[PDB]
Structure formats: structure tokens, C-alpha cells
Amino acid sequence: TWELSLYELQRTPQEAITDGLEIVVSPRSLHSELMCPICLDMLKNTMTTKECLHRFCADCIITALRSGNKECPTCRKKLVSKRSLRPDPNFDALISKIYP
Amino acid sequence: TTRIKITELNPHLMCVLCGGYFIDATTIIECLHSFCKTCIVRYLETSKYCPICDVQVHKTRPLLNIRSDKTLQDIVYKLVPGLFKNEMKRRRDFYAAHP
Numbered sequence: 211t212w213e214l215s216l217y218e219l220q221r222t223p224q225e226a227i228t229d230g231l232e233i234v235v236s237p238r239s240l241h242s243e244l245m246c247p248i249c250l251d252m253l254k255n256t257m258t259t260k261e262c263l264h265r266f267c268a269d270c271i272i273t274a275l276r277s278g279n280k281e282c283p284t285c286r287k288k289l290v291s292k293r294s295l296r297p298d299p300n301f302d303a304l305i306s307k308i309y310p
Numbered sequence: 311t312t313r314i315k316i317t318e319l320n321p322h323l324m325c326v327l328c329g330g331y332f333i334d335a336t337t338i339i340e341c342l343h344s345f346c347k348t349c350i351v352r353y354l355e356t357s358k359y360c361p362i363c364d365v366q367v368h369k370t371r372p373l374l375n376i377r378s379d380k381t382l383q384d385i386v387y388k389l390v391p392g393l394f395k396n397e398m399k400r401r402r403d404f405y406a407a408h409p
């Protein structure tokens with residue numbers, strides 16, 4: 211269930227930043243979130259599992275399910291069907307901003 | 311390593327209902343669109359279709375096909391300086407006034 215707590219019921223927007231500050235980002239920074247745990251490089255052609263929202267490479271995920279475990283390599287949950295895999299364009303849209 | 315103007319990322323880090331950054335980021339597992347947890351729950355109280363792409367989330371129970379996106383929410387808390395401080399402090403303040 212998605213019941214909203216008292217806080218969530220009355221929470222306000224978190225105002226965004228128009229100021230034009232700049233953040234510094236190394237290939238190491240945020241790496242825990244951007245690395246395909248298959249190939250440990252940058253996500254290219256991202257895929258996401260619909261049951262658990264886990265991202266992998268399109269070219270990489272085909273081989274991990276090919277080696278006989280049919281679960282999600284991250285949370286170890288049975289990956290049902292084939293429609294559980296969708297390419298993630300809104301996520302690759304994000305990679306293209308961070309070449310290193 | 312590069313430096314990026316945050317005005318360049320704000321599209322990828324903002325809820326179209328809230329006009330602000332994602333807090334408790336949540337994702338429709340059909341179209342991979344994402345909104346604040348509270349924003350989309352209130353939205354889906356009146357529509358079974360995505361606010362942006364306009365797909366049908368479900369014929370009957372829309373909440374069935376949305377998941378937390380902690381992977382996405384973590385990217386926000388890391389790129390946006392002190393957003394996590396600010397949001398956590400907001401919640402303490404609340405429960406300091408409502409026990």
C-alpha cells in the first residue's frame with residue numbers, strides 16, 4: 211500500500227535551483243549508480259527490470275540470463291516473462307550529459 | 311571530471327507535477343516516467359494514465375504498476391547539494407511539531 215504519512219500528505223515542493231551553480235563530477239563519483247554490475251563500465255543502451263527498476267546494459271543483460279539463473283542479478287528475484295525488460299530512453303538521456 | 315551547470319540537469323531531476331526536484335522518487339514501470347512519490351499517488355487517484363506520455367498504467371488499479379526508484383532518487387541527492395539535508399531537516403521539523 212501507498213498510504214501517505216502526515217508529512218507526505220502536506221509536503222511542499224523542494225524548490226529547484228535557477229542560480230546556475232556548477233557541480234563537479236568525476237568518473238568515480240556516482241559510480242555506484244551508473245555502472246552495469248555485469249561489465250563495470252558506463253551503461254550503454256540501458257535496460258530496466260519492471261519488477262524492481264534495476265538498470266543494465268541491453269547488450270550485457272542477454273548473457274547473464276543466458277547463464278542459467280533467470281533472476282535479477284541485483285536483488286536475486288525471479289525475472290518473469292520477456293516483457294519485464296524495457297529499454298530506458300529517459301535514462302540514456304541522462305548519460306549523454308556526463309561523457310566522463 | 312567535468313563541471314556542469316545544474317540548469318542543464320534540472321530537466322532530468324525534476325517532477326513535472328511539483329515543479330521541483332524529486333523527493334521519494336517513484337516510477338511507472340511501463341513507460342519509465344518518474345515523479346515524486348506523493349505527486350504521482352495523488353495523480354493516480356484520478357487517472358489511470360501517465361501525466362506525460364499518456365499511457366494507461368492499468369485498467370483498474372494504477373498503483374499496481376509503479377515502483378520506488380531509489381536508483382534515481384540517489385542520483386538526485388548526490389548531484390543536488392544539500393537537498394538531502396534540506397529534505398531530512400524538513401521532516402524532523404514536522405514531527406517536532408506533530409507528535
Ligand SMILES: CCc1c(-c2cccc3[nH]ccc23)[nH]c(C(=O)O)c1-c1ccccc1Cl
Pocket residue numbers: 257268271272275289290291292293294295296
Ligand atoms: C534483455 C533480455 C530481454 C528480455 C527478457 C526479459 C526477461 C527475461 C529474459 N530472458 C531472456 C530475455 C529476457 N526480453 C527482451 C525483449 O525486449 O524482448 C529482452 C531484450 C531486450 C533488449 C535486447 C534484447 C533482448 Cl532479448
Ligand SMILES: [Zn+2]
Pocket residue numbers: 246247248249250251253254266267270271
Ligand atoms: Zn554492461
Ligand SMILES: [Zn+2]
Pocket residue numbers: 259262263264282283284285286287
Ligand atoms: Zn532486481
Ligand SMILES: [Zn+2]
Pocket residue numbers: 325326327328329330331332333345346349
Ligand atoms: Zn513532485
Ligand SMILES: [Zn+2]
Pocket residue numbers: 338341342343360361362363364365
Ligand atoms: Zn509515461
